[PDB]
């Protein structure tokens with residue numbers, strides 16, 4: 001389908017986008033930073049295919065308190081102008097706040113089991129996402145975006161992230177070397193990566209892609225965790241550790257910069273970030289995990 | 291996909307770009323393939339596990355059959371070495387194709403085509419010929435089609451780093467220019483028309499490709515645009531190249547190849563920005579060879 005006439009500044013070949021940071025991976029996937037992309041062209045590209053973006057989010061037990069701010073900020077910054085179908089997974093149906101949604105956007109609530117330990121709740125996300133895409137076949141959406149709930153949107157998060165498979169760089173470890181990365185270092189684990197391996201440390205709280213790729217990934221990670229459980233082992237960073245094992249063995253077709261998941265309290269706002277888009281809501285871990 | 295094996299390679303650095311001297315990504319987030327931007331180990335893994343097959347089309351019409359020898363022999367050294375390759379030589383002379391020894395898992399087929407008298411028609415009619423070829427045997431034989439001029443020789447690596455849904459190549463004598471200077475078709479009456487305030491890049495008609503579905507889509511559309519022009523009594527300023535540039539403007543390429551992938555050393559030298567010269571023109575006499 002052909003793009004219409006558009007007027008915009010010309011891509012200048014001998015004038016780099018950004019010079020301080022890496023904008024492309026050695027397997028030729030983009031790293032998304034401000035000033036790398038023209039959202040006008042990308043919006044038009046994705047609007048011509050009438051793209052539908054699913055956004056999954058688990059708000060179990062005390063994490064329902066996070067829903068309102070998460071959902072309202074999503075209205076103002078997440079894939080605006082495009083079709084959005086939210087998926088809210090919770091143990092409490094009544095506790096989901098009434099959030100006014102812009103046109104072409106809807107919400108569905110799906111009840112799940114509540115696990116005792118906070119590690120299991122986070123881990124079993126992979127299982128529940130997989131079981132849901134299996135049950136729906138795909139149908140409704142073209143892409144799925146899977147994020148933590150304890151977050152607020154502050155700036156634009158649009159179709160630039162959309163690609164068959166994507167992860168995001170953990171804000172803690174983008175300037176760290178691979179032996180400083182907190183991979184699972186026990187060879188007994190299905191998530192084991194030795195000190196000589198690894199590209200990036202990816203976040204467990206922001207990944208996604210096409211439905212096919214996301215179903216594939218969540219299933220791989222859950223079965224990987226089931227073998228660990230049977231072997232009596234729990235991965236150091238739980239769901240995150242298995243995603244890292246997976247994105248090492250199956251490279252993402254785009255990678256997102258720490259612009260797309262930050263913590264201003266813990267890490268501030270360094271010069272390499274022109275925009276903070278998706279940010280940690282301050283939480284008392286021990287108390288909110290009960 | 292296909293699960294990658296354990297590999298040992300230098301770690302990519304987020305705070306340390308490979309190339310600070312060039313644009314390595316388009317405004318629509320397509321990689322621009324320069325030397326330094328990729329690790330061939332990783333890419334060779336990804337594709338080889340797919341059992342990827344590459345089709346290379348090339349036109350040897352009339353006197354341009356003389357170029358085939360050097361073209362094919364240099365391709366065997368540098369083009370897609372280690373992957374399944376099939377050469378498609380389109381000629382009006384089946385007895386003029388030189389006997390070139392191929393590596394394992396590599397094929398060559400000669401297809402007979404007519405020879406239009408004018409060189410412009412020879413060049414422009416490649417789009418129809420590639421498309422009729424694509425339709426004849428759908429995506430029956432290859433996963434990707436690469437479509438290149440013959441007045442050429444490989445001088446360095448040209449591999450699976452080029453493979454994507456749809457790619458184009460930055461013209462060597464324009465990569466530094468500004469869009470108003472690009473020699474697009476400027477007459478509103480032509481289909482290839484692009485006004486002064488549009489355009490991202492000036493692409494080459496002598497090096498493009500992509501997936502079988504995408505290439506056949508491109509060549510067909512280009513041929514149709516040309517038929518409409520010939521009916522209107524107009525021929526685009528730079529022929530198939532012009533129609534291609536219109537097509538890639540309206541359908542952005544998923545990868546862009548840097549001038550590394552088509553250069554003229556006799557005309558333009560070897561600038562510092564080009565670490566390699568992978569695929570270069572063979573100096574020719576334009577009036578005589580085109581006849």
Ligand SMILES: CCCCCCO[C@@H]1O[C@H](CO)[C@H](O)C[C@H]1O[C@@H]1O[C@@H](C)[C@@H](O)[C@@H](O)[C@@H]1O
Nearest residue numbers: 170171172173182204237240262263266280285
């Ligand atoms: C020495 C560097 C410290 C950087 C902070 C690390 O954050 C934590 O990283 C581990 C992986 O090793 C895991 O992903 C949890 C993560 O902490 C969460 O996210 C950060 C950004 C903060 O918001 C924490 O409070 C969260 O619990």
Ligand SMILES: CCCCCCO[C@@H]1O[C@H](CO)[C@H](O)C[C@H]1O[C@@H]1O[C@@H](C)[C@@H](O)[C@@H](O)[C@@H]1O
Nearest residue numbers: 461462463464473495528531553554557571576
């Ligand atoms: C101001 C730019 C000068 C660069 C040389 C122009 O080359 C010719 O450009 C036209 C369109 O503008 C078309 O692409 C043909 C092209 O000439 C061929 O390619 C170059 C690189 C040389 O190798 C020539 O000998 C070829 O005929």
Ligand SMILES: O=c1ccn([C@@H]2O[C@H](COP(=O)(O)OP(=O)(O)O)[C@@H](O)[C@H]2O)c(=O)[nH]1
Nearest residue numbers: 057058059060061063118121122148149150
């Ligand atoms: O009791 C819980 C514990 C976890 N989660 C979900 O699991 C994710 C991971 O937990 P958390 O955000 O605390 O991990 P962290 O950001 O600390 O790594 C949360 O975002 C929630 O979506 C939940 O809904 N209820």
Ligand SMILES: O=c1ccn([C@@H]2O[C@H](COP(=O)(O)OP(=O)(O)O)[C@@H](O)[C@H]2O)c(=O)[nH]1
Nearest residue numbers: 349350351352354409412413439440441580
């Ligand atoms: O008489 C001709 C004219 C052209 N060509 C083919 O069309 C391509 C483009 O023509 P040419 O190389 O002259 O264009 P240039 O590179 O000079 O712009 C050539 O590489 C050939 O493959 C051919 O085979 N015979």
Ligand SMILES: [Mn+2]
Nearest residue numbers: 148149150205
């Ligand atoms: Mn979180």
Ligand SMILES: [Mn+2]
Nearest residue numbers: 439440441496
């Ligand atoms: Mn040529």
